[PDB]
Structure 1
Amino acid sequence: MNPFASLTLTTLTILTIPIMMSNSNIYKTNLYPNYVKTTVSYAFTLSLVPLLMFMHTGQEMIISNWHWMTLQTVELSLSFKMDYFSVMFIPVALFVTWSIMEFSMWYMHSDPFINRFFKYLLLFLITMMILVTANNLFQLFIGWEGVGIMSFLLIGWWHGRTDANTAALQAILYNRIGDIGFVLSMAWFLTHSNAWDLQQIFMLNNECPNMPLIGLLLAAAGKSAQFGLHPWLPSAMEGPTPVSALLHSSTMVVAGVFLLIRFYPLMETNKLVQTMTLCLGAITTLFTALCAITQNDIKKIVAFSTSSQLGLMMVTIGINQPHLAFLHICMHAFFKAMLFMCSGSIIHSLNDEQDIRKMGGLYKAMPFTTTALIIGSLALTGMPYLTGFYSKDLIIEAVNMSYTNAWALLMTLIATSLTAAYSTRIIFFAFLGKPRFPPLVLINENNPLLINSIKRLLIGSIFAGFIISNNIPPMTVPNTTMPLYMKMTALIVTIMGFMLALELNNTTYYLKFKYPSQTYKFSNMLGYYPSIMHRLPTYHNLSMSQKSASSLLDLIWLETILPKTTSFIQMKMSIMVSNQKGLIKLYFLSFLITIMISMTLFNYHE
């Protein structure tokens, strides 16, 4: 019965079996992580078949298998969309997850709760598939919040450490700010189009107004950490390195860009939202590439690189090229994950040290790690014929040949120079020169799990661009006519960034010491955004929620007006009424007054 649907559903279904096995006698043994890794590899090789079917005949499907509940005119059903985006993203995500789980089998070997860690990673993967294949907005929101909660749990893995809990709560806060816009889009779409499912929404909105698209943009900015809501992603490096390689670099953080790619038919007919997306992406990529070039923690550098690449993805969406943005997501996953994996290898070898200022000459001490990191850096910088090139080169040359904001174009070019500059910094500082680490040398990368995982991701980072570019149907109109200088703009700016960073890193060898400028202080302290925005709003919010909401209103004035006033009045009148001396003279005089008043007041009027 056209095995496409059955295979696409089995790929997602077999991922949940190790979750159902979490209360069996496999979860208490030391075979559980290998079991989960084998399950993920099997899921990947199974998902490879629907991809081949699509690449052969372009087949696409939607499956509404279960009818969950029905409203008066709205029907909600468990529905899966199996178009190009899903059937292309699922194998890439499964491949990356397989490599990262095999890496974690070595990186987290000394963790007493590795079984739980593997279960957690698997849970995140399931929620991401739910997000990616969802056909209606409620299912997509389920996946959205699932991956958010999974990232919260994985960031605070070391729950005895205060900073990890702070980073997890910060991630939740920013993603809730985005969730506001997600809910706004949901409410607008239901009250105006009468549906949450994707097919109906496209049909009823030929010219989509501003509000739903602005809500979608806010949600995407929250999930992909754009300039307004950026800081949580770098602070998410508090979790273990495998979490940073899988969730916060390649798969979970592209969710906002994927959400905008899903709703591209509506974004195609609104110029203002497109312009806002383009400008947001441009400022995000420039700001994060500028922050990355002066960071000393290697994980921070890779996190800022990921944020800048997300900004570039947003820019690509802003110029009405969603398929290029999707291709860039698929291309970036490989080398970003492998770069984080090499960083984790270096960190583990040097006794959990992350500062690049204490990393010496690892070019010779770490040959395979050096080779992998060099290949990943060259691919990230869009070196010709590599995986990065088949997306980033086209993105740059499509930004150049469009009617677009000029400032956005300038910031995109400066950011793509700063990318090469930051990549150069890691290589020069981490691999060249003389050792700076403690003298008890424990460097050892001879472990088959690490070698195999990084080798798989390296083959990906070398050949995936060519293979996937040649195996997809043309969904764009190519730019076949460019001035020669503009065709080489990306290469020229990359080379200039390379040379400038090399000069500025070579001058550190001189015996000259000068105090830093204000530009360096701005770049290193992330423009003072976390220093101000994490102190002023939080202080005012908490202080007002104590002084005014709790004390001034609830404990004082709301008490004062209704119950305290009643008690005071009743007590005063009780004292007035009950305090008589018991002398018959006084209240018999009172009786006389009452009798006289009564005859005239009520008796005279009959």
Structure 2
Amino acid sequence: ASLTLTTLIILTIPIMMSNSNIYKTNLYPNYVKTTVSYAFTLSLVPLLMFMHTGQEMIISNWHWMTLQTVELSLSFKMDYFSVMFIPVALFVTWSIMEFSMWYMHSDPFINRFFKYLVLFLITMMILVTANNLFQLFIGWEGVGIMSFLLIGWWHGRTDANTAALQAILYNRIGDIGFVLSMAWFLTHSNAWDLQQIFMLNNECPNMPLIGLLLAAAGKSAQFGLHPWLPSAMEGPTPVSALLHSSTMVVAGVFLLIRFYPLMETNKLVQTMTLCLGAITTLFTALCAITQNDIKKIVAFSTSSQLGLMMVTIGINQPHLAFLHICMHAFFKAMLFMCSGSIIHSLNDEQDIRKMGGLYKAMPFTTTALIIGSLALTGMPYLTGFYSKDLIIEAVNMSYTNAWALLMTLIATSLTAAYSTRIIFFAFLGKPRFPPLVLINENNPLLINSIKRLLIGSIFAGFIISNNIPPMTVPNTTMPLYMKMTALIVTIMGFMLALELNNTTYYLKFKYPSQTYKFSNMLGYYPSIMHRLPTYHNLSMSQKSASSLLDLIWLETILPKTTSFIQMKMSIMVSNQKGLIKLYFLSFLITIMIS
């Protein structure tokens, strides 16, 4: 009990130290990396007490505001999920610390940058741990705004700002659904607590689950909400590595994971979740096939992974769905950091088409990127396997809609596809980056970082798949091609993508087909869903609302009316003249009437 709360609270202290003069020193950040280090060291312990005996805990140390009936209070449930997840975040983020010390080493305000890092992570901890739903909302929204502060880090260029605003916007659109659900549980279940809600809702909830689903779509970048995530790469790399790889965006489905039994109450929820998660895997992966940024490709990848695990929830297997995240973080952090090594090495040139062929120029980064790509690919005993195979297999043997399963298949093909694209252009070719070569892999902390993530990247799949209690109950029978399919689809991926890529190498200019222009225009989706509705609204908010509705009628209807009528009346009564015969005769007739 004391343990977990300590593995949270100590993280708070450096921010407190932020006003202390040490913050102004160059010396500060290493206290932070060390801080997360101790935090991790401490963080392992609850997991082990969780291991052999398996106990789980909730604490709610202090009620915050006792309403009638409802009395919300902060409450740190520490179940399987919340205990297992913390060491992961501490681990990868610690590696990001060590990375960032080098990636930014030139940069002024770097100390502030780390402050924002810890400030982000702590909110993430607020989200993963919280029992009481409202506390989940503070973790939610706070993570959102940290995303805003970090995306806009290079605040000078406008594009960073638009990206930030874009991200907050789609998150907010999800937040509408989150609030709808959040109200509905209170109106009905009278709760805001997972105990209450799990207890009282044996009955089917026809609607809250869908709005909550929309909220889950928020962070997770489903198909209707994907674009901000690709645009979020515009912030400096260690940031995008930090959370758009893993620590942020996975939380959006993590929410949905937390509420499995209610999902289980419905059929339509598992349904639609699958219905959409599949198609976002596909539609994202297609754009992922054909890009030129390192980071955009890796971004589309991460979202596609998210769609996959989203059907993993929608296939009614939450446990594996959570299992996939814990593997996923290592992979993606690996990719973005090695990519950061490339990019920093070359004076920052994201575009692959003038990215060199540097297989030998940076051999260690090469190794790293290779194990990474193989891990994401889903190689048979490497870490990505223990998720991906179990997943898609379970999807196979499950009763379900099939067309979505098909989509899972094309998607898992395309994984191999773009994953080979980046390898090919990054390394194999005779180099074509502009001459001079400032390249310098060397700087030991970076090395140590990538080392540790490789270590996890290879052992963790086996170790964790072994240690966890068998909540899965395995399906292992008919047929044989069942298990083969995951491999053969990959192999088709490498064969087609690679022979195609080599065919690109044979002169003969061609001009693009329509499919190329489509999938490489990110599905056209941003360029239509952004240049259109925003125009109709910003026009409408002036063509109408700002203007005629409220500056010109709403003022005409009662100030300008009376103000005019008094003009007429006042010039009429006070008619300036004053000839006697006039009004005097008026006295006459007014007497005759009176």
TM band (smaller chain): over 0.9
1:44 matched to 2:44? The reply is no
Gaps of 5+ in 2: none
Contact 1:179/1:219, CA 8 A, preserved across alignment: yes
Residue equivalent to 2:364: 368
Superposed displacement of residue 378, structure 1: 0.3
1:62 matched to 2:62? The reply is no
CA distance, structure 2, for counterparts of residue 509 and residue 568 of structure 1:
79
- For the aligned residues, what is the CA RMSD? 0.7
Superposed displacement of residue 580, structure 1: 4.5
Residue equivalent to 2:119: 123
Helix, strand or coil at the partner of 1:159: coil
Helix, strand or coil at the partner of 2:76: strand
Q: Deviations over 1:317-363 (max 9, x none)?
A: 00100000100000100011111101110000011111111122221
Q: Deviations over 1:541-590 (max 9, x none)?
A: 00000111111111110111100000000111011100142221111111
Residue equivalent to 2:409: 413
1:168 matched to 2:164? The reply is yes
Superposed displacement of residue 31, structure 1: 1.3
Superposed displacement of residue 530, structure 1: 0.3
CA distance, structure 2, for counterparts of residue 507 and residue 476 of structure 1:
44
Q: Deviations over 1:9-53 (max 9, x none)?
A: 000000001010000111111111111100001101101000001
Q: Single out whichever of 353-362 and 559-568 deviates more from structure 2.
A: 353-362
CA distance, structure 1, for counterparts of residue 579 and residue 406 of structure 2:
99
Superposed displacement of residue 213, structure 1: 0.5
Helix, strand or coil at the partner of 2:440: coil
Residue equivalent to 1:88: 84
Superposed displacement of residue 474, structure 1: 0.7
Q: Deviations over 1:436-459 (max 9, x none)?
A: 111111111111111000000000
Helix, strand or coil at the partner of 1:227: coil
Q: Single out whichever of 579-588 and 499-508 deviates more from structure 2.
A: 579-588
Superposed displacement of residue 482, structure 1: 2.5
CA distance, structure 2, for counterparts of residue 364 and residue 546 of structure 1:
58
CA distance, structure 2, for counterparts of residue 496 and residue 159 of structure 1:
43
Gaps of 5+ in 1: 599-606
Helix, strand or coil at the partner of 1:364: coil
Helix, strand or coil at the partner of 1:158: coil
CA distance, structure 1, for counterparts of residue 568 and residue 357 of structure 2:
87
Q: If the length of structure 2 is used for normalisation, what is the TM-score?
A: 0.99
Superposed displacement of residue 374, structure 1: 0.2
1:567 matched to 2:558? The reply is no
Q: Deviations over 1:523-551 (max 9, x none)?
A: 00011000000011000000000111111
Helix, strand or coil at the partner of 1:483: coil
Contact 1:15/1:39, CA 8 A, preserved across alignment: yes
CA distance, structure 2, for counterparts of residue 178 and residue 322 of structure 1:
21
Contact 1:381/1:419, CA 8 A, preserved across alignment: yes
Helix, strand or coil at the partner of 2:432: coil
Q: List structure 1 segments (4+ residues) > 3 angstroms apart after TM superposition.
A: none
Q: Deviations over 1:88-134 (max 9, x none)?
A: 00000000000011000100101101100000010010000000000
**1:455-604 equivalent positions in 2, closer than 5 A:** 455-598=451-594
Superposed displacement of residue 216, structure 1: 1.1
CA distance, structure 2, for counterparts of residue 136 and residue 488 of structure 1:
44
**1:363-442 equivalent positions in 2, closer than 5 A:** 363-442=359-438
Helix, strand or coil at the partner of 1:66: strand
Contact 1:158/1:164, CA 8 A, preserved across alignment: yes
Q: Deviations over 1:466-520 (max 9, x none)?
A: 0000000011221111311111110010011011011011111101110110000
Contact 1:207/1:269, CA 8 A, preserved across alignment: yes
Helix, strand or coil at the partner of 1:268: helix
Q: Single out whichever of 572-581 and 257-266 deviates more from structure 2.
A: 572-581
Q: Deviations over 1:223-246 (max 9, x none)?
A: 100000000000000111100111
CA distance, structure 1, for counterparts of residue 368 and residue 523 of structure 2:
32
CA distance, structure 2, for counterparts of residue 208 and residue 360 of structure 1:
57
Contact 1:207/1:270, CA 8 A, preserved across alignment: no
CA distance, structure 2, for counterparts of residue 553 and residue 176 of structure 1:
27
CA distance, structure 1, for counterparts of residue 429 and residue 567 of structure 2:
86
Contact 1:67/1:78, CA 8 A, preserved across alignment: yes
Residue equivalent to 2:104: 108
Q: Single out whichever of 584-593 and 59-68 deviates more from structure 2.
A: 584-593
Q: Deviations over 1:144-190 (max 9, x none)?
A: 01110000000000111100000000001000000000000000000
Residue equivalent to 1:216: 212
Contact 1:207/1:266, CA 8 A, preserved across alignment: no
CA distance, structure 1, for counterparts of residue 123 and residue 478 of structure 2:
43
Contact 1:86/1:132, CA 8 A, preserved across alignment: yes
Residue equivalent to 1:134: 130
Helix, strand or coil at the partner of 1:488: helix
Helix, strand or coil at the partner of 1:64: strand
1:317 matched to 2:297? The reply is no
Residue equivalent to 1:602: none
Q: If the length of structure 1 is used for normalisation, what is the TM-score?
A: 0.97
Contact 1:339/1:373, CA 8 A, preserved across alignment: yes
Helix, strand or coil at the partner of 1:177: helix
Contact 1:210/1:273, CA 8 A, preserved across alignment: no
CA distance, structure 1, for counterparts of residue 478 and residue 510 of structure 2:
45
Helix, strand or coil at the partner of 2:434: coil
Helix, strand or coil at the partner of 1:129: helix
CA distance, structure 1, for counterparts of residue 466 and residue 111 of structure 2:
40
CA distance, structure 2, for counterparts of residue 421 and residue 96 of structure 1:
26
CA distance, structure 1, for counterparts of residue 116 and residue 250 of structure 2:
19
CA distance, structure 1, for counterparts of residue 214 and residue 343 of structure 2:
36
Superposed displacement of residue 210, structure 1: 2.3
Superposed displacement of residue 211, structure 1: 1.3
